[PDB]
Amino acid sequence: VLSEGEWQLVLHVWAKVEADVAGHGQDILIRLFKSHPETLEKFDRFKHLKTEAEMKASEDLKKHGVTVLTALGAILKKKGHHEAELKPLAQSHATKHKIPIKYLEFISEAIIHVLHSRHPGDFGADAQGAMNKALELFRKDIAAKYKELGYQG
Ligand code: HEM
């Protein structure tokens, strides 16, 4: 369980993300695909992209990054009360996309890396610790929902 003060560190950096959600989404997905190339294989829509330049030029990937970060932002704004938001996302990612918990750890690492690079004004050690706690809570709750849904994760 996060404290209110931890939630405020999360939401304070997220407000900066929201100045340019599309650019942040590009950076985060590219970082994920570069650090853990196996994750790109999960995306039938994107797995043909060969280089960072093609990723950056892909209008479809940009759109998808907006979708992902807007969904995550709506979860974070719930400050842990995210049961309704998690249901549909857990179901699609367990049953259709088949995204293991290890890959949600990889995107969490990519989010942290980009925030650390872009926002050292709002992403010092305490803020990063709060964000990590929020992402760990998200992954814990997704893992619980995956088990309910029948997916090992
Ligand atoms: C912060 C974590 C994540 C969030 C909030 C998120 C959110 C979303 C949303 C909102 C969608 C569209 C609606 C849906 O299908 O549920 C989506 C689609 C998808 N996600 Fe995620 N996602 C996350 C992590 C991941 C990871 C780590 C992978 C793969 C390694 C992944 C793979 C996919 C795939 C394959 C699709 C379908 C894309 C398409 O063809 O349209 N997601 N995600």
Side-chain angles (χ1 to χ4, degrees), residues 1-101 103-153:
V1 186
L2 282 71
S3 68
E4 172 67 9
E6 286 166 344
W7 285 118
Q8 289 302 325
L9 292 171
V10 171
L11 294 173
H12 190 253
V13 75
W14 205 258
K16 307 303 171 205
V17 170
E18 289 180 334
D20 175 25
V21 71
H24 287 79
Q26 292 175 301
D27 285 4
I28 289 167
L29 291 173
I30 292 170
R31 175 68 191 184
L32 173 62
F33 298 149
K34 164 189 164 173
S35 294
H36 302 280
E38 63 270 38
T39 62
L40 179 59
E41 301 317 306
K42 290 283 179 177
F43 292 81
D44 293 335
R45 257 205 315 141
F46 302 125
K47 64 182 173 191
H48 65 291
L49 294 167
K50 294 182 185 289
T51 62
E52 171 169 1
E54 285 185 355
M55 293 171 186
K56 281 186 188 145
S58 171
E59 283 315 305
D60 284 344
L61 185 61
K62 184 170 89 162
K63 283 180 185 106
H64 186 60
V66 173
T67 297
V68 169
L69 292 188
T70 300
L72 178 63
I75 289 161
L76 295 173
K77 289 170 195 188
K78 291 307 281 278
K79 303 189 305 192
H81 294 275
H82 53 227
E83 167 77 353
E85 293 79 3
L86 252 44
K87 281 182 190 182
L89 272 172
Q91 182 179 224
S92 65
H93 286 69
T95 309
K96 180 179 181 179
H97 311 315
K98 296 263 156 209
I99 306 309
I101 295 299
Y103 288 8
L104 292 181
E105 289 164 3
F106 295 157
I107 201 175
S108 297
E109 174 192 308
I111 292 161
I112 288 169
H113 174 99
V114 172
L115 289 179
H116 177 260
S117 178
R118 291 180 78 146
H119 297 296
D122 287 280
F123 211 69
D126 288 344
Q128 176 175 155
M131 181 63 73
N132 176 62
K133 204 171 200 198
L135 299 174
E136 278 184 347
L137 173 67
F138 168 69
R139 294 195 309 273
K140 176 186 177 72
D141 287 356
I142 290 291
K145 192 59 65 178
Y146 280 179
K147 175 177 186 79
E148 295 170 18
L149 291 164
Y151 176 52
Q152 302 314 297

